[PDB]
From TrEMBL, chain C:
Name of the molecule in the record: Cell wall surface anchor family protein
Residues of the full protein shown: 852 to 1107 of 1107
The species this protein was found in: Bdellovibrio bacteriovorus (strain ATCC 15356 / DSM 50701 / NCIMB 9529 / HD100)
Classification lineage: Bacteria, Pseudomonadati, Bdellovibrionota, Bdellovibrionia, Bdellovibrionales
Domain of life, per lineage: Bacteria
Disulfide bonds: 149-156, 168-228
Transmembrane parts of this sequence: none
Length: 258, 255, 256
């Protein structure tokens, strides 16, 4: 056939449709579609000199046995790369991947000419009120947004809930002793577990002026279930830091970077 | 009926088309919500020919007013998965297509993302305007969320969102304890008292050292963010001069 | 007036097939770049005429005697072409330039969270004074494609034009003298500080183990080498140079 196929509908309820139907069995004994069965396709082909070659296609394919549930995907294929985009039965879209774990998945880079808005995971601790253990203050409160960090369940740190990269800064005020003081960020009180890693930034300063801040910083990947703490290295140095409710006396801030 | 449908075109200028046409009446112009056509997939489940994906073209306006349509991509299971509106705007998991791409869910990218990020700065505290409000010699910004140039005394938040802010200023030569604070148009409490934000500040005295103040949390459109000394009598003990190393305010949109 | 294609069987399926050649049936010729292989077109009556109401096209991106390469195009009534999928699999929304795997000409709104690789790098351990505003650093580390902190001991090299947020710190020694460091472009502080489109600052400190800090925020160019250190050699005697990162670090994050 060389003629364009025209489907024309006049009316208020009806529409024009190309309908592609798939069953197993026969018209006399139809059987349910099975996982992996192609329901149908719109196929493009082009002459290359010697053969008709696949030149793009849009496919509907079953992803569950239909006697169990009607679940399908849509596939968009181009000449060259082959399958370029998938829409799974969940509605989840993959570009360059067929594993559609999130609502949109891109196997590659993304370039946007304007701006991107999204929920970003971050959390804070505020108000160092007592020394719990080395490198672990008790904090009066915490707060967080998103799903990667929990800063409210534990009074002594922020819990990492997802593997990821995190940027962390902890500050606390020196008291009035005039002695040198510092705080450090730690993994459940273990400073070395962070500081000794060759894939992170870990630092801290000293201070002595009353009301000035000693600071500690971390940048790098953390593991789910990690409790991030911050505090004085030892009890006698905690005696020389300010412990009180207002956040200006001390805070920890954690941002998910990636 | 059981046979594949083929459309074959040869030659230099023409192409193969499946064309689906819709009118109302028997002829009446297409109305909003009318389907122009669809490619429909159906599969036997043992009881019926069940919807197994479809690609639809649907009118978004009455055609006597304007020819506006959307394209819809449906799957068996979730139903409509992706929409392209007459604006070209794409929705995945939503039919509300406000921006060029809208995703109702999370996005996972294996590589890196480039985009315009909103941020703004104030540089060079040149005088005390009010409690927690310096006059700044200049400002600069990128993007659409923050305006650091219209006013010399603060950065205006143009869009509701989450912001990370740090303000620093140098102590002078008095040896007195000095500090600065970030504020909402001079009102420090309006930020500090919130249980959904970080707000802090340090003291310093050594000449050329920084007092710093930090904020993290949501701000509202039209908010004017300021930073400065808590009281006029302290201004004499801070450094006010043009170079940015004397003091700056940095605002980054986080989300 | 519907068109139905029904298939019963274990392996057979229903297809609409659109084929394109040049030439004639007895003397065909290969598809050329820009030829349409086929299309699904929608049209709607507006009262006067049949108006374009969306289309899905397959179009050649190479001469087929060289290679079979096509794109898919999705057009809507109103804006016209809205999405393109190139032969590489790269997708454009609002643009036909498909440089990356996804390209959006506009804004993007996500209700949830986005995960992606972010470029960042660090230098750790100021071990010597090399030149004004240039420390030698014991080690570097980076993630991503925009920043290289391991090739040069004296800085982080920007590999791609972009916006960067940079903080450098170093500990004062035991003298009680005023010390500072600054971020620089290959030791040239003024090259950054004098720019009206950037933040550049630094502090002084004197207390032993306290930090002097310098900060930068703004755009940088490919091949820029970012350094940080004391302003002059005589001040090195009053800063701490040693391997542990708590003595000093530089952190660079790509912002955009």
């Amino acid at each position: 056939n060389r003629d364009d196929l025209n489907i024309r509908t006049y009316g208020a309820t009806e529409t024009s449709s190309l309908i592609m139907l798939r069953a197993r069995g026969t018209a006399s004994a139809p059987a349910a579609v099975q996982t992996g069965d192609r329901l149908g396709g719109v196929l493009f082909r082009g002459w290359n000199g010697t053969a008709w070659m696949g030149s793009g296609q849009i496919l509907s394919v079953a992803e569950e046995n239909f006697t169990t549930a009607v679940k399908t995907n849509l596939q968009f294929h181009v000449g060259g790369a082959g399958e370029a985009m998938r829409i799974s039965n969940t509605g989840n879209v993959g570009i360059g991947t067929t594993t559609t774990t999130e609502k949109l998945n891109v196997q590659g880079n993304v370039a946007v000419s304007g701006e991107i808005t999204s929920v970003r995971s971050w959390g804070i601790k505020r108000g160092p009120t007592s020394f719990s253990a080395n490198y672990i203050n008790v904090w009066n409160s915490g707060y967080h947004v998103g799903s990667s960090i929990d800063c409210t369940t534990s009074t002594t740190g922020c819990r990492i809930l997802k593997a990821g990269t995190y940027e962390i800064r902890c500050v606390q005020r020196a008291g009035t002793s005039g002695n040198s003081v510092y705080v450090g960020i730690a993994l459940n009180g273990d400073r070395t577990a962070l500081e000794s890693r060759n894939d992170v930034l870990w630092n801290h300063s000293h201070t002595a002026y009353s009301g000035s801040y000693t600071e500690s910083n971390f940048m790098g990947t953390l593991s789910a279930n990690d409790l991030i703490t911050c505090g004085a290295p030892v009890n006698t140095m905690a005696a020389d830091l300010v412990y009180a409710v207002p956040a200006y006396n001390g805070t920890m801030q954690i941002k998910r970077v990636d």
